[PDB]
Amino acid sequence: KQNEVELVAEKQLAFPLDEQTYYLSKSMFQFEENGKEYLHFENTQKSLYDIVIFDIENQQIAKRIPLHKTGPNGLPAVFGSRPSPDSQYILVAQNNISRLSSINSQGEIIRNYNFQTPEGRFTPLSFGSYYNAPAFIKDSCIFLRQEILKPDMKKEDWPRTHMFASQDLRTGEVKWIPIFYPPIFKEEYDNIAGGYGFSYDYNYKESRLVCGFFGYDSLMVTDDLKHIRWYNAKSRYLKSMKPKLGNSMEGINAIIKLNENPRYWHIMYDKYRNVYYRFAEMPYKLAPNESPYETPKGKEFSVIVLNADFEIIGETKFPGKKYFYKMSFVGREGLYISENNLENPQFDENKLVFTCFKIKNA
Ligand code: NA
Ligand code: NA
Ligand code: NA
Predict the structure, then answer these.
(1) 348 alpha carbon, closest ligand
(2) Å from CA of 81 to ligand 1 middle
(3) Which ligand is nearest to the CA of 349?
(4) Ligand nearest 67 Cα, by number?
(5) Contact 20, 48 (CB under 8 A)
(6) Number of domains in the chain
(7) Which ligand is closest to the CA of 48, given by its number?
(8) 3-class DSSP state of 254
(9) Which helix (H) or strand (E) holds 204?
(10) Which domain, by its residues, includes 353?
(11) From ligand 2's centre to the CA of 69, what distance in Å?
(12) Which residue of 57, 99, 220, 292 sits 20 to 30 Å from the alpha carbon of 284, by its own alpha carbon?
């Protein structure tokens, strides 16, 4: 049934920092290397520009991978980076210059790739964790989310718009993947402010892609990058929903509504326990002193647990002003959720803190 399990806090991980490492990363991923687990932590916020690898067992920094802006190993515009599958070969996204790059553990460039649409158009290049969007590698190609190719989408355009593209890491060839946006977007605005986002994860055990549109009750699953199945993944605390696109002409109001309204966020596969976690944001109303552009520190959330057959087996609600759930990862011991919320009474900008949540019978 839907109430067999719950998530329960067990231990904490705490990494002491200094001025060389900022506590926030938008591209942090757990990985295994040499028999141990680590956190790949892209450290490109503010004036910083490198990658830090954290040692989970020893709760400390393991190494620092330099990133240079110029020179023979110059990476002008890193935003997003991933262990591929470990720190010896890392892929980095450079959206602003239409480039994907591979680097080694010393930050040296292996190869630069131009990444544009087949017809030579700019297309957003990203992967990261701020919403779970890890990319994935199949048959030596990297697969990435793709955004819409024209600002004024009609109903008919969604099922003709690709959700993913891949780039061959030998040849650089980009291919559109025949997985299309679902026909669940009704508004026809001249310019869309948001509302069609999704999170995804890739289950290498079953060669299985799972996508969760922020505005939709159901998860989309495919095992052959073509044929789609849908599974209910609705929070018991939220009214059933379908996406609501924002209208750019509404101005800041469109952004505020998306920020504050209930919606889903990460979908995350747990490779150790063979379960999925879907995060859900509870309803909120943005207060005057709060920024329209970021999730409020007080927004409540839940995590839905689904088993390997995509059956909901439990859901646990979390308070606001405590967690920074946009820094979450699955480790050997469980689901780790950061406590680096500015309104947490224990917040310390020089300590990266996570709580480990284990699955217990309810
Ligand atoms: Na120091
Ligand atoms: Na710091
Ligand atoms: Na640097």
Answers:
(1) 2
(2) 26
(3) 2
(4) 3
(5) yes
(6) 1
(7) 3
(8) helix
(9) none
(10) 1-362
(11) 21
(12) 220
Residue 249, SS3 per DSSP? helix
Q: What is the DSSP letter of 257?
A: H
C-alpha of residue 26 to centroid of ligand 2, in Å = 15
User: For residue 27, what is the DSSP state?
Assistant: S
Q: Could you say which DSSP state residue 216 is in?
A: -
Name residue, tokens 């503010």: 46
> Which H or E run includes 11?
strand 5-16
Least Cα distance to 23 among 267, 235, 324 occurs for 324
Residue 157, classed as helix, strand or coil, is: helix
CA 57 to ligand 1 center in whole angstroms: 23
3-state secondary structure of 255: helix
Dihedral in degrees, nearest 10, Cα atoms 179, 158, 325, 49: 80
Distance 73 CA to ligand 3 centre (A): 11
Contact yes or no for 323/337 (Cβ under 8 A): yes
Q: How was this structure determined?
A: X-ray
Burial class (CB in 10 A: 0-12, 13-18, 19+), 315: buried
| Reported resolution, Å | 1.8
Rounded Cα distance, 132 and 153, in Å: 25
Residue found under tokens 């998306």: 258
The Cα 83–Cα 309 span in angstroms is: 28
3-state secondary structure of 177: strand
Breaks (C-N over 2.5 A) in the chain follow: none
Six-digit token string for 221: 């699953």
Three-class secondary structure of residue 156 per DSSP: helix
Contact 265, 325 (CB under 8 A): yes
Which of these, 195, 179, 164, lies nearest to 258 by C-alpha position? 195
Q: Pairing mode, if any, of strands 174-180 and 162-168?
A: antiparallel
Task: Give the integer Cα–Cα distance in Å for 66 and 313.
Answer: 43
Among 144, 207, 206, 131, smallest CA distance to 179 is for 144
Ligand approaching nearest to the C-alpha of 49: 3
Q: Which ligand is nearest to the CA of 16?
A: 2
Please report which ligand is nearest the Cα atom of 74: 3
Distance (angstroms) between ligand 2 centre and the Cα of 16 equals 9
Measure the CA angle with vertex 242, ends 221 and 328; round to 5°: 60
Task: Look at residue 107 and give its three-state secondary structure.
Answer: coil
Distance (angstroms) between ligand 1 centre and the Cα of 353 equals 19
> Side chain identity at 181, as an amino acid letter?
Y
